[PDB]
């Protein structure tokens, strides 16, 4: 996007210079993917296994921990598309996990 930054310029703006990846744009097909709420990571990636309407079989994509979760607590993904921006609007998922 923009000029890269010194030691002091990159104190000034953000990083501009963000990047793209097949793997996470593969990935993709894992629709399922949803954030999941944690006292450690504050939230984390898991997936839609059995839909319960209300609850979810909800599965981590970490620790495989089969987690039978409700919707309204499962917080829909958001792709490293919009990381860590320079304004905090640009972000799709105006979610708490983002």
């Not at 990047?19 to 593969?26: G, I, S, T």
Request: hydrophobic share 35%.
């Amino acid at each position: 996007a923009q000029k890269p930054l010194s030691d002091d310029e990159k104190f000034l703006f953000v990083d501009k210079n963000f990047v793209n990846n097949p793997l996470a744009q593969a990935d993709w097909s894992a629709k399922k993917l949803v954030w999941v709420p944690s006292e450690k990571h504050g939230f984390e990636a898991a997936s839609i296994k059995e839909e319960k309407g209300d609850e979810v079989t909800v599965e981590l994509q970490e620790n495989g921990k089969k987690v039978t979760l409700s919707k309204d607590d499962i917080q829909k993904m958001n792709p490293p598309k919009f990381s860590k921006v320079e304004d905090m609007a640009e972000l799709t998922c105006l979610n708490e996990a983002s």
